Write a protein that binds this ligand. Structure first.
Ligand SMILES: *[C@@H]1O[C@H](CO)[C@@H](O[C@@H]2O[C@H](CO)[C@@H](O[C@@H]3O[C@H](CO[C@H]4O[C@H](CO[C@H]5O[C@H](CO)[C@@H](O)[C@H](O)[C@@H]5O[C@H]5O[C@H](CO)[C@@H](O)[C@H](O)[C@@H]5O)[C@@H](O)[C@H](O[C@H]5O[C@H](CO)[C@@H](O)[C@H](O)[C@@H]5O)[C@@H]4O)[C@@H](O)[C@H](O[C@H]4O[C@H](CO)[C@@H](O)[C@H](O)[C@@H]4O[C@H]4O[C@H](CO)[C@@H](O)[C@H](O)[C@@H]4O[C@H]4O[C@H](CO)[C@@H](O)[C@H](O)[C@@H]4O)[C@@H]3O)[C@H](O)[C@H]2NC(C)=O)[C@H](O)[C@H]1NC(C)=O
Ligand SMILES: *[C@@H]1O[C@H](CO)[C@@H](O[C@@H]2O[C@H](CO)[C@@H](O)[C@H](O)[C@H]2NC(C)=O)[C@H](O)[C@H]1NC(C)=O
Ligand SMILES: CN1C(=O)CN=C(c2ccccc2)c2cc(Cl)ccc21
Ligand SMILES: CN1C(=O)CN=C(c2ccccc2)c2cc(Cl)ccc21
Ligand SMILES: CN1C(=O)CN=C(c2ccccc2)c2cc(Cl)ccc21
Lengths: 40, 51, 106, 333, 80, 102
């Protein structure tokens, strides 16, 4: 929101990047956490 | 936000009010009052939706 | 059926040296492992009843060390009367013994 | 046998209503404790649980026998047939012995008349906790005992040289506290019935801030940073910043209320109330600052342009300075 | 819906399996959650085409009560 | 579950299991009031405690328990995941709806 009306392309780029980086990172955290706490 | 927050407040009042008396299977007079008040609040939101 | 594996299968040793015998259990045996000594053409004699308790009439050179699965029997100043076979046996369940270790002199 | 005749000869002409040396000298009682565990120290009722093996030893010239056996080792069956001191714990709210499966008591009489009496007790003792500096606080609150009816001229207590022994200290029920040490004390107190010899054991405890940290110190600071993020949002989206600020206020109130239910209903300010109070103030100041911003963009824009840019650096520095001064001032005490 | 669920949970004991009332609350929550996701989907493609957006909106207006009534009859016929 | 003798040392009263130690502590089949855990088995032992008054026989029994995750999943781990997903759904709304994403 702060980057709109000054650099719209950067705001669009970081919202499209964070549209796919967040589910991947949360899934990787879920896999690592459940793997380390179910095989413990 | 008027309609939805008053519906939330009615829900909270109903759950927080039914814990005083035991777990009887019939309706009391506070239950009828709460039901009619909930109907009025929900009806106000539905009238807003129609308008 | 708790199996006790005793090591080594055969050992040799001189007089006046420290010696260590080991017994390993497959399952849990708390402190109910006993050590018996059997001379040739004789009946076995209980040396250590339970984990680390000497029987009445055993010299103070035998001493045992216990755990949940790993058990040890150590003799200190070894004389010429420790030339015998040594069995470890568990009593947590129906009793099973080890194979034995025959000490010899060389 | 022989123990039966000895025990029957000791109890003939015996009066368990009279202490030894009833008109000669006071009775000297040597006391030992073994703390099995110090239970949960809840501050709501200002109390703490403790489990001990209380051992007493004294001399009874009536229980003196001549025989080839040196010691009679008995159960609790004969405890009620000889004289037993009336020791009671002065700062206990509730205390009970143990009776499963048989009364957990022990009596041992020696060849010269020395009696040793041991029993297992679970005490729910009382200690007023000065709950300032909470939760960075340290306490030392006692377990006291004395005789109930016999004054200083009739019963005298005395510690041994190996008086109090703690156990493993790891199987104890101290969740929020940490044992650091102990010290014994003996004194004489004046009472309406007479002067009594009172013995105290002070246990020193220190509160480990590991639960209150992840319960209140981390989330309230996170909610403050949540209120901080409103400054980088555009000044034209008025419902966004207002809703953010007031919902942040909601979260602060709910967290404060749910956080105050740990400690008792004390009337003074602690080191935990001040923190959550200042966090609420910070959120209040952020919202009122945006309010004055929205009024000033309409009144005169020359003053409201660089106010938000000033707030963006003034709020974190003020909060960080508050945190530094607060933590040093409350960890120096 | 979360408030409703929280109030109920404190009464019941810590049992692992899913009760019938918990099943109903999960159904109601999944319904209101998919309603919010449907709004997110209509808002994502609103500037590009309004025809598909209006079609999804009027399809939701008819197919959410029908699927809810189907879930309600399946629930009140399996647990009775 | 440790039990032993009060007032009687090891040279006076000793304890022992009446059957084989693996078969002495017997838990019934329908005997389980557990809601949150799962009993896996039993484990006995026997030892000696060294007190200020002598050595005492102590019989130990360990019951092995395993916590059931089914309650805590539905209580915390599934609502946390659903709330994280609800936060992530804000990335799909348009940049012109600032109070919505706020
Ligand atoms: C208001 O009313 C209240 C209700 O009436 C009242 O409370 C009662 O107070 C009295 C007096 O304080 C209590 O009486 C004593 O209890 C002592 C043990 O107490 C605790 O245990 C009881 C239960 O009693 C049982 O269990 C013990 C231990 O196993 C047994 O020894 C008892 O016999 C009794 O056993 C029966 O029941 C068991 C099941 O529970 C069975 O398994 C068992 O087989 C029996 O059937 C609890 O109720 C108590 O709880 C209370 O008090 C505590 C205090 O802190 C509270 O915290 C708690 O909340 C409860 O309120 C507690 O847990 C007994 O030891 C004692 O018996 C002795 O002393 C008297 C006086 O000298 C003797 O006459 C009597 O014979 C007993 O003596 C012998 O045994 C002792 C053992 O230590 C020996 O040392 C002694 O030498 C003597 O041995 C002789 O006899 C033996 C045979 O008996 C023989 O073998 C020996 O060789 C020798 O000859 C006494 O009974 C009473 O229990 C309370 N009841 C309740 C319900 O609370 C309250 O005080 C009133 N208040 C006022 C102000 O008036
Ligand atoms: C418990 O009390 C005893 C005596 O009341 C304390 O004992 C003394 O220890 C000092 C050295 O630390 C000796 O010089 C004294 O002679 C001891 N007293 C006696 C009577 O022998 C003991 O230190 C106390 N334990 C504490 C405070 O933990
Ligand atoms: C009920 N409540 C709130 O709403 C948040 N702010 C308050 C407060 C805020 C500023 C000054 C004084 C008190 C507060 C402080 C505590 Cl220690 C516990 C609950 C609580
Ligand atoms: C090592 N030890 C003591 O010295 C105090 N008395 C003993 C004891 C006292 C009487 C009978 C059996 C054992 C005891 C009991 C426990 Cl439950 C933990 C530690 C401990
Ligand atoms: C276990 N569970 C979910 O996983 C879906 N999200 C949750 C949730 C989300 C946030 C807070 C509390 C609960 C929820 C709400 C209900 Cl009314 C029933 C089941 C249910």
């Amino acid at each position: 929101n702060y980057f709109t009306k000054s650099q719209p392309a950067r705001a669009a780029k970081i919202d499209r990047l964070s549209r796919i980086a967040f589910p991947l990172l949360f899934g990787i955290f879920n896999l690592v956490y459940w793997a380390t706490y179910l095989n413990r | 936000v008027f309609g939805v927050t008053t519906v939330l407040t009615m829900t909270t009042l109903s759950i927080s009010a039914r814990n005083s008396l035991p777990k009887v299977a019939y309706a009391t007079a506070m239950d009828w009052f709460i039901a009619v008040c909930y109907a009025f609040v929900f009806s106000a939101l539905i009238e807003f939706a129609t308008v | 059926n708790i199996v006790m594996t005793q090591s080594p299968k055969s050992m040799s040793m001189s007089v006046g040296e420290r010696v260590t015998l080991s017994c390993k259990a497959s399952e849990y045996v708390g402190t109910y492992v006993s050590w018996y000594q059997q001379k040739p053409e004789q009946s076995p004699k209980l040396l250590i009843y339970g984990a680390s308790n000497r029987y009445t009439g055993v010299p103070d050179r035998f001493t045992g060390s216990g755990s949940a699965t790993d058990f040890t029997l150590t003799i200190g100043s070894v004389q010429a009367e420790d030339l015998a076979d040594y069995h470890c046996g568990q009593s947590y369940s129906y009793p099973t013994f080890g194979a034995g270790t025959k000490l010899e002199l060389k | 046998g022989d123990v039966t005749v000895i025990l029957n000869n000791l109890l003939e002409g015996y009066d368990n209503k009279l202490r030894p040396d009833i008109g000669v000298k006071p009775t000297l009682i040597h006391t030992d404790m073994y703390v099995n565990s110090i239970g949960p120290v809840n501050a709501i009722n200002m109390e703490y649980t403790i489990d001990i093996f209380f051992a007493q030893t004294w001399y009874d010239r009536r229980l003196k026998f001549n025989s080839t056996i040196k010691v009679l080792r008995l159960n609790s069956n004969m405890v009620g047939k000889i004289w037993i001191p009336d020791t009671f714990f002065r700062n206990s709210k509730k205390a009970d012995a143990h009776w499963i499966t048989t009364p957990n008591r022990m009596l041992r009489i020696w060849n010269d008349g020395r009696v040793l009496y041991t029993l297992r007790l679970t005490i729910d003792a009382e200690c007023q906790l000065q709950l300032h500096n909470f939760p960075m606080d340290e306490h030392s609150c006692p377990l006291e005992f004395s005789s109930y009816g016999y004054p200083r001229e009739e019963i005298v207590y005395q510690w041994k040289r190996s008086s109090v022994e703690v156990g493993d200290t790891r199987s104890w029920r101290l969740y929020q506290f940490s044992f650091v040490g102990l010290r014994n004390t003996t004194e004489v107190v004046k009472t309406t019935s007479g002067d009594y010899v009172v013995m105290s054991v002070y246990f020193d405890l220190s509160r480990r801030m590991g639960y209150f940290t992840i319960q209140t110190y981390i989330p309230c600071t996170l909610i403050v940073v949540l209120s901080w993020v409103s400054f980088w949002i555009n000044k034209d989206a008025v419902p966004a910043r207002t809703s953010l600020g007031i919902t942040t206020v909601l979260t602060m109130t709910t967290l404060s209320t749910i956080a105050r239910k740990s400690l008792p209903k004390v009337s003074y300010v602690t080191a935990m109330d001040l923190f959550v109070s200042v966090c609420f103030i910070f959120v209040f100041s952020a919202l009122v600052e945006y309010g004055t911003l929205h009024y000033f963009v309409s009144s005169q824009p020359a003053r409201a342009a660089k106010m938000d840019s000033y707030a963006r650096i003034f709020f974190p520095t003020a909060f960080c300075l508050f945190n530094l001064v607060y933590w040093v001032s409350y960890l120096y005490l | 819906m979360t408030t409703i669920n929280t109030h109920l949970r404190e009464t019941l004991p810590k049992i692992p399996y899913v009760k019938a009332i918990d099943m109903y609350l999960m159904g109601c929550f999944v319904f209101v959650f998919m309603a919010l996701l449907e709004y997110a989907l209509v808002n994502y493609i609103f500037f590009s085409q309004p025809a598909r957006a209006a079609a999804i909106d009027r399809w939701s207006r008819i197919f959410f009560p029908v699927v809810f009534s189907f879930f309600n009859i399946v629930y009140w016929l399996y647990y009775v | 579950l440790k039990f032993g003798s009060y007032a009687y040392t090891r040279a006076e009263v000793v304890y022992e299991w009446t059957r084989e130690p693996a078969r002495s502590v017997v838990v019934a089949e329908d005997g389980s009031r557990l809601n949150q855990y799962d009993l896996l088995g039993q484990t006995v032992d026997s030892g000696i405690v060294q007190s200020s008054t002598g050595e005492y026989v102590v019989m130990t029994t360990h019951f092995h328990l395993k916590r059931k995750i089914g309650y805590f999943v539905i209580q915390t781990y599934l609502p946390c995941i659903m709330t994280v997903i609800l936060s992530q759904v804000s990335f799909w709304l348009n940049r012109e709806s600032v109070p919505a994403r706020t």
